[PDB]
Symmetry: C3
Subunit: 216 residues, 3 copies
């Protein structure tokens, strides 16, 4: 078992991919998500409030496992670690990201989980050989979806995936049912309107409707 | 604004992907295309007459912006520049192409536009980090199409694309309407039969039917 | 003509992608396949019996052309060569595999065929520039299939492909009919049940139903 496996054994298999404009929404949003049993929170660096939001959730909502997404560069990677990210998700993987991740693991100060995107068998093999065997498949739905993941299970049976990209309320359970899929990223729990309006009851409702892995 | 942006603000958003067997067809073809308001001409190096065709159009049709496509190697890249290509399109990107492009930009003699193909989030990130933020998506239609481009807009909102591959009269406007799409490559304006028969009126007709970006 | 071309001119265009649990099934399986006119046998390294199965077939069934698949690392590559593999198939390609293949070709002792997976135009161009012009497309059916291969024929007209992944009795002939497709990998000839039960007549039947390339 990895660190990611251990977290996933204690929360729901659905990672909200969070786009948050206002820092002040971070804590209530996260509190609303954990209240519905959803603890692995990926705050993307797609807004200026992203990093600050991580730090705020980290401090104020110790039960959430808060991470950074849309980490594209080594500098993004370092800033996530400084903000207090417990995990880092990237949409793809480059030699510069591989190098950065190795280096922070070598220094031993950040012991979090790096979860990078792959989209081809060759990308999988490059990530696996850098030592990363749990990968994001991005953007899963547009690039072949369940069929792609299933085809990859044959030659790569020890690699596990988190598909992200076009995962929905209506198809997430099908992805999760794949034997090489351990979790999925989804956007619908933290839609923009919900955050701007502070509709924390609806966020909690959407989280509470997510099923545990053993219940698919 | 890039050089490409500046050209596109002054012509139609459709780049003919040209396969030309006979040098003698180059000038009348290009004259037929500009007469229909289509100025960005990608002459692929898929025939022996390709390079010569570029040079001929460059000299004789100063209003066309003439480029090279199917540039696969550094040597292809250099020969395009010697032929007088104003832009270079490649179906994919390699370290050797990245290196070549850097080197000609460093030498400062060729100030044209390099527009390379990407097909995965990781390929985008590698091109963007070499300094290229306007990319070909190839072959767009077979690898996930509008859905793929839209999914990529989330993590890569500052990258713009030119989809090529299965763009048609019937779907180009849908691609162009994507906020991260600035232009598209298409084959139908310069079909083989039209060139071999010298049917310049039909070429001009096909070009004139292309709509400006503001008119989709 | 390549070595692969020469083999394919003398057998059926269908490469069984073999998953074999028990060493003892290797010889009768292979004998059943050649009896149906199917000689290019890819024994994947997805089971512990994989390597041994290669060696057994190599010795006992000299008319089969026996290879290794699911070669992911340089060490997998070397072990295949030691087992007696005549060809090596990998699901993707990495710098470490490129390097290994160069090095065994430089040493001149293994003169077999390396057939690596590609899934993007950029992957093709990287393999072609290492000197490999006959490639696996993997997993062909989930990543755009016949349409993808056809789109690639335009810029890469001298590259030939073996699609593998979701090739079936019902669609293999369509893949084979593509001018840039020379053969295909399929799983249905050596299904698990057939091997475990020793149903060699059915294996031979499935092989005998495969058509020669000139008969599509």
């Amino acid at each position: 078992m990895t660190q990611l496996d251990t977290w996933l054994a204690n929360t729901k298999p659905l990672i909200p991919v969070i786009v948050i404009d206002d820092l002040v929404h971070a804590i209530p949003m996260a509190k609303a998500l954990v209240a519905g049993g959803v603890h692995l929170l990926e705050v993307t660096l797609r807004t200026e409030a992203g990093l600050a939001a991580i730090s705020a959730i980290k401090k104020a909502v110790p039960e959430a496992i808060v991470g950074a997404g849309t980490v594209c560069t080594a500098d993004d990677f370092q800033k996530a670690i400084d903000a207090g990210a417990q995990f880092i998700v990237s949409p793809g993987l480059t030699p510069e990201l591989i190098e950065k991740a190795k280096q922070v693991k070598l220094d031993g100060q950040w012991q979090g989980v790096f979860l990078p995107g792959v989209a081809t068998a060759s990308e999988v093999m490059i990530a696996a050989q850098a030592g990363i065997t749990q990968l994001k498949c991005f953007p899963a739905s547009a690039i072949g979806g369940a069929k792609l993941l299933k085809a990859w299970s044959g030659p790569f049976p020890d690699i596990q995936f988190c598909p992200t990209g076009g995962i929905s309320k209506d198809n997430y359970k099908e992805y999760l049912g794949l034997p090489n899929v351990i979790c999925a990223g989804g956007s619908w729990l933290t839609e923009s309107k919900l955050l701007i309006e502070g509709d924390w009851n609806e966020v909690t409702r959407r989280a509470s409707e997510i099923v545990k892995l053993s219940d698919i």
